[PDB]
């Protein structure tokens, strides 16, 4: 009902008698409602609400890295609604989004959009009840659909009767159909019907049905071809059904659509060679014909070409699915084999290349790519001649990486047009401009070249030149002037030359360009035209929504359509800026900040805002325009395009801004001319902040602080400057903005860098320095959590290490002990103050490390540590308990005693925690028992009740406390965003989301042969969902746990970065929880299977398979020379296993769109994981350890025990960076490594290099972790262990991040590589010499 | 106080070092004109955008269009130069006479002889090196 | 008609920018595009361009850290073979041998001997064919 008014308040008193986030959920549920008017009211109310609660909404969006979950759900819902049929609803929902803002897909989270689609219900045959049922539903919806012809509804009910003839509903058949269909079909289900139409013979008329009078119209062509076919099929039941539905077919084409596929299947089963040739003729004709290619009266044809293409495609698709299912049957008789053979033969008759060309004609890009790769492989056809078509395709799809790959592959020199394609897809547009000029010289009669020239000009921002260029072109040719008018319009309105806008607009009444529409709106604003304004507003909103409509029906849709979403954002902002003029609550700053960080996103919004400000007449507009030009800088500077803001860095101009200087400095710094930047910056500082008068006020003090900090950083970079001056500058920055975090942070970093040098690397001397360091770090934290990941861990490491060294010196008998002791006391006091000031979650973030050092030797240090950990525990008992469990049950007694001390202190602080602690202890003990429960016999499945009674009971008791199901989402804390820093540090919610407590266990427990017989359990969550948790004996997971943490941090990074996001790079992460050193519980990842098993099944299906003994024969002695091994490999192992993985892709995903999306995801995921592994030195990537999700196609890695180049230590050393066997490559597609995969690798590598500091700090903490079983277990168990290769491991990790291979022999001085790094890595992985050496277990041949 | 004058001088002397030094000395922010001068003295890409902003600031000045056309020349964008001069002419007939030299140079470089002849015919007052070269080549 | 020349000058420009790797790839592709091993390039100027390209690839390799010493050495030797009388080949080969010697010999001249003989001989021949690097070579 969703009333919103006092009358609605009467209804609400009613609802109270019956019984912002709340209202939001309500409106959400509303919009989903079926009644269109219901939804419309919902949407209107929602739009108003959003406008009214804009403040709280923005706060939700920007307070924390990730948006409030409710927001994510709401945006998913709105984008869905975009798909709705009613135009009004679509427009309303577009307004919804635009009002929300253009949230960076990163900040949003889409797990709801599983989008299975309820599709792929391939029907094996007509006989199948479900298929005949769908046919009956078709006919019923048909007869009801139209009353225009009594004969037609009569034909549908007649087919109902004939279906009763084929099979009686009276009771499975009746059971099959629903009641809204049941009651509709019942009146004629039994009555009777005369033949709806007079008999006609499609076979009598002989002609290619396409291009025939009957085939003139699409539906009529559907009617003539299907009738002919029905005549053709030699199937009595098929003939019966076909005749039954014939009459209905004449009236509605859609019934024809449903029927044709199986009609063809039956025609294939019962075949005449001449009939087969005629069928292939019809299909080829439909495919061969290009509506633009052939000339005829197009009233029928225009629609006919497209529709017929789609129909033939669908028919072939059903044929393919039928053939695959029949091959599965055959493997699982002879008549079915013959039928399947006939169908496969007909399929073969069709040309893949033809299919691809047609598809491309029909804009069915994805299917085109699929067909084209299928062609390039199925029939081997060389490297070099089809590249043009494939490149054009990728261009269409807008997949840049496709174009880049295609280029990377082409051997022959690239044609000019191809270089144009490449520069457009990805290029600085400078080469683009010059190539355009050269094209104009090469071709003087093509408009598109001038298009590109003008577009480039605009990009650089040379408006006036663009206007004049358009005018010139106009002078040369009048006709082109119409097409080119758009860019002139854009320049004008951005130029703020309204009159020119009016002229050019009046000139053309045929341009639908976004730019032209924007100019129209701005004009209607300039000259107050309320009615026209709002009309154009509706129109443009609809237009924009159009593309997003199709975009919605896809995974990751939001991202794919983000451009249009930003357009809607601009529209909303424009509306709210204009309204007051006609007769502006929105907060522009926050809005902009929510947007993704890339040109495509920010720039257009900013230009539009400059325009609006121009239309607005406010005194401060002159300066606001400077802020907008300066806001364009740091939105482009970050991207590159350094000339793309000359008309910005200059444009800013008048508005007084030391900010102008700071910006010019950052720019120079990006460009590499550091000394320049320092000069310009010192000058701007002197000028804007003369020493005589202090800047004490607001933005002035702020900018002064920022400038001083930047000066300091520059000075650090330059080698000339003295340490002391740097330290002084940083201290000054701190003094001028004590509240700022960056100040203290950089100060601490610099002191840290200096300390090793000043102290000679002697801890004793370092003490005082360490105090200063930790103090400033903690302060920085207290202000903001931007650099938390680098700050916290470093501080903790330093303090704890100093404590350890002091304990050693006290035990030693060395004089420095007393000074060290006083220093340590001071340090501990500092830590205490930090504890008091810092919020709990901030410690939570390194809680892992904290726990790691629980066994520290010095008691005072331990007291402090315990205070910290206890504060945390109280703050977040669930996560803390999970993380501490293992240590609790450690075999080492000291670990257990200390953890118990901690828990006791906590309990003392908050009693209620005691009950929960006891419950958790009991639950963990029982789970450990289970994990270690010995299986008897095969015992594939064991009932919970039969064996694990105590567990079911314990969970059953109502007294038992709720235990949060361990899940990565609930373990990895989120953090407050920089934008919002007020009271966020105090009230920040670490784990905003849905918390599922353990409500019970499904009875059945699975035991898996592989993985050393690990039990698999399924917990039952409070929400009712079931989560499957594998229980693993004999594995130390601590390593895996911390690695998962690091992966989560990497995932955050990947999400924030534009380039990674657009590709949707992400590392699949599964929660891991160690019950104790030997046993831990690991979350299951469903729909996923190992590469080895999958390919093994494929091979067996192909009949080609290698026996284990065969392999043993192929195996050779390790001492054998490399030549013999390479031989064995190439000669036998590679031959035996041909590349088939692409087939797995094909079968798993039938639909072209799903196929393409999943293939892309596969490439991206494998790339990301390979890079990450090579950085972390992941090893043992053997078939089973790597996995692929059947649902998305992504790749997931497991068995992260082998880390930090432990593989080399193996008897058979691992000599490859990551697992890239020929099969995986084949998977990626014909392009192979080159293409998507390469670009993903490169992007991931770049990102990692950028965040090198935070990752490196975290990894440091990880490597020096004492709890981790770095070595073999000794005696079964100070409860501390030290990793001997720690320093070496950190050095190697750093180098790899640096990009310094250091492998080079005979010369150890090597400049870092950049992309050549990814290239050399790929080469190494691919090389056969290496692989052949690799151990058989890795199954390199596969 | 007098830095503008010294910069102008060094510009006249064709002494780039002078202008660079001036710029380095100035405390105040550089005006757009002085910026144009410095760009021109010390070698073109940045100067094109500066010229664009200039034109936007003052439309009537012809020197700015001169600079933009020259730049487009240096980069090798002949065709663009032709179209640009043509557009300017469309807007202002007068300017066409001063700008004809660039068009002629472009053409002659394009090898488009008809355009060379026609443009050279347009006006008979240019003595620019480029214009004489075009006359010779056409002959 | 100047494919080889094209790719070579291009590699040079690219290097100028700094993307050494993108240079090496394009250059190797060109080496395959023209003078493609199917038959030995003896065609005079063609042989010259072939040698120039080979030497360029060799110096590139030297720049990149991945490539092994032996391969670089072999490439320089190939350039030497291709053009016996071209100084550049000999000079660069000598330079690379010099740089390698200290590590190979562990900085023990005794072992350094034979390498020294090779190096000196190649310097000398380089001098016979030209005088571009005399100041580096002779001393
Ligand atoms: C018109 N006369 C001047 C001229 C013009 C072009 C050339 C030329 C052509 C090639 C060439 N480039 C590639 C290549 C390039 C880029 C990428 S990329 O991934 O960065 C992404 C940007 C695509 C990947 C591969 C592959 N094969 C090739 N044959 O190299 N130089 C030489 C002279
Ligand atoms: C209207 N346009 C917007 C706008 C306005 C002003 C600024 C601005 C002003 C200054 C500034 N520069 C210098 C300086 C010194 C030496 C050279 S140099 O020739 O040696 C070099 C080519 C190597 C160049 C410049 C000296 N004092 C200064 N105050 O820096 N940025 C930036 C954008
Ligand atoms: C020395 N360290 C020992 C060690 C060993 C294993 C792990 C481990 C395992 C998983 C994990 N595996 C799967 C999984 C695995 C295989 C297949 S399979 O079809 O190929 C067929 C072979 C069953 C299907 C699914 C799903 N979800 C998961 N979380 O995670 N960690 C960790 C440490």
UniProtKB/Swiss-Prot annotation, chain B:
Coiled coil start-end: none
Question: Where does the UniProt annotation locate this protein?
Answer: Nucleus; Chromosome; Nucleus envelope
Tissue distribution: Ubiquitous, with highest expression in testis.
Q: How is it modified after translation?
A: Phosphorylated.
Function summary? Serine/threonine protein kinase which activates checkpoint signaling upon genotoxic stresses such as ionizing radiation (IR), ultraviolet light (UV), or DNA replication stalling, thereby acting as a DNA damage sensor. Recognizes the substrate consensus sequence [ST]-Q. Phosphorylates BRCA1, CHEK1, MCM2, RAD17, RBBP8, RPA2, SMC1 and p53/TP53, which collectively inhibit DNA replication and mitosis and promote DNA repair, recombination and apoptosis. Phosphorylates 'Ser-139' of histone variant H2AX at sites of DNA damage, thereby regulating DNA damage response mechanism.
Q: Please give the family membership noted in the entry.
A: Belongs to the PI3/PI4-kinase family. ATM subfamily.
Pathology noted in the entry: Seckel syndrome 1: A rare autosomal recessive disorder characterized by proportionate dwarfism of prenatal onset associated with low birth weight, growth retardation, severe microcephaly with a bird-headed like appearance, and intellectual disability.
Subunit structure as annotated in this protein's UniProt entry = Forms a heterodimer with ATRIP, forming the ATR-ATRIP complex. Present in a complex containing ATRIP and RPA-coated single-stranded DNA. Binds to DNA, and to UV-damaged DNA with higher affinity. Interacts with MSH2 and HDAC2. Present in a complex containing CHD4 and HDAC2. Interacts with EEF1E1, the interaction is enhanced by UV irradiation. Interacts with CLSPN and CEP164. Interacts with TELO2 and TTI1. Interacts with BCR-ABL after genotoxic stress. Interacts with UHRF2; this interaction promotes ATR activation.
Query: What is the protein name given in its UniProt record?
Result: Serine/threonine-protein kinase ATR
Please tell me the species this chain comes from: Homo sapiens (Human)
Name of the gene this protein is made from: ATR
